[PDB]
Amino acid sequence: GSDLTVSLIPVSGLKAGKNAPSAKIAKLVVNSTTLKEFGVRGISNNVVDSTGTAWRVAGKNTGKEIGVGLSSDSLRRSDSTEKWNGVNWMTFNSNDTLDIVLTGPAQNVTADTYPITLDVVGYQP
C-alpha cells in the first residue's frame, strides 16, 4: 500500500468482428495508502480531446485502428481537469477504478493485437 501501484486489467468482451457499443475492454486500478487523487492520460499517436481520455490505437500486425478511451461513466467520476506539464489531465479520486471501452458507436475490430498504454500520475500530499 505504501507504494504507487497501478494495474491495468483486460476484461472479457473484446472480439474480432462486431463489438457491443461502448464495450468494456480494460479496467484501471490505482493503489496507494497515501494518495488522494490521480491523473491519467492514454499515451498515443493521436488524441481526440485535449484530455487524452479518448484516442486511437493500431494493431501490431495489420495497422488497423480501434477507438479506445474512458467510459462516459468513468469520465463523470472526474473531480477536476488540471494543467500539468503543459497538458490537460483529468483527475480522479484514488479510490475510484476506471473503465476503458471501445469508444463511440459499435466497432468492427480486425483480429490483431492492440497495444494500449496509460500514463498515471500521483502528487503526494
Binding site: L4, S7, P10, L14, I116, P125
Partner: protein, 208 residues
C-alpha cells in the same frame, strides 16, 4: 484469457523531501519489478509545469530488477526567498520495457510518483508542526478560509469540522490563505499536518 494484466509499481524512500539550504538532498528509488525499468527524474515548480532550478542525479537511468538506488537532488540556481519556504515537485517517472508478444490487447503503463521538494532557507527555523497551531480559520458562507501566518508550507493531512472530514485539501503556502469547502457541518475545527518525515502530526484544535 488472451491479454495479460499489467501490474506496475515504483517505490520512493519518502513522500516529501526537505531541501535544507545550508547542506543537496537525497531520495531513494526502488524497483519492485523482476525486470529492469527506466527512471526519469525531474523537478517542476509549484505550477507543476515550469521546470525548477533543481536537478536530480542521475536524471535518467535504468534501474535493475529489484534494485534500490539513491537519487541526489541539487539546487542549480534561481533566486530563492530567504524568509519563507519555496515549494517544487520532484517527479520520478518509471517506464517498463515493451511487453514480449481474435482481438487481443497488449496492456502497458507508465507511472509518475511526485513528491513535494520543499526548499527551506537557513533563516526559517524549526519545522511546520512547531507552528501549525498558528493557522487561523474564518468561516464565510459555505467556505472555510485558512490563514497561514508562518514561513512554511502547511501540508494538511486532515481537517475536520465537527468530526466531518474536509476533502480536496490543499497545502497552505507561507504567508498566504487558502479556501476549503465546508463539509455541511460546525464549531470545532481539528487539523493535522504531514511532518517533514512523512507522518501525521498530533491534532490541533480551534473554535470558530
Amino acid at each position: 484469457l488472451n491479454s495479460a494484466t499489467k501490474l506496475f509499481s515504483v517505490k520512493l524512500g519518502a513522500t516529501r523531501v526537505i531541501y535544507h539550504a545550508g547542506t543537496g538532498a537525497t531520495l531513494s528509488v526502488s524497483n519492485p519489478q523482476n525486470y529492469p525499468i527506466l527512471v526519469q527524474s525531474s523537478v517542476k515548480a509549484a505550477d507543476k509545469s515550469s521546470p525548477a532550478p533543481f536537478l536530480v542525479m542521475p536524471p535518467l537511468f535504468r534501474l535493475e530488477a529489484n534494485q534500490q538506488s539513491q537519487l541526489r537532488i541539487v539546487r542549480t540556481g534561481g533566486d530563492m526567498p530567504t524568509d519563507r519556504e519555496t515549494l517544487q515537485w520532484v517527479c520520478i517517472k518509471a517506464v517498463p520495457p515493451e511487453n514480449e508478444p481474435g482481438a487481443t490487447l497488449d496492456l502497458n503503463l507508465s507511472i509518475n510518483a511526485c513528491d513535494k521538494l520543499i526548499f527551506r532557507p537557513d533563516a526559517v527555523k524549526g519545522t511546520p508542526e512547531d507552528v501549525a497551531g498558528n493557522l487561523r480559520w474564518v468561516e464565510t458562507g459555505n467556505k472555510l478560509k485558512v490563514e497561514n501566518p508562518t514561513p512554511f508550507y502547511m501540508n494538511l493531512a486532515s481537517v475536520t469540522v465537527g468530526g466531518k472530514p474536509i476533502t480536496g485539501l490543499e497545502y497552505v503556502p507561507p504567508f498566504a490563505d487558502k479556501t476549503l469547502n465546508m463539509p455541511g457541518s460546525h464549531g470545532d475545527i481539528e487539523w493535522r499536518v504531514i511532518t517533514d518525515f512523512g507522518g501525521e502530526s498530533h491534532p490541533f484544535h480551534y473554535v470558530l
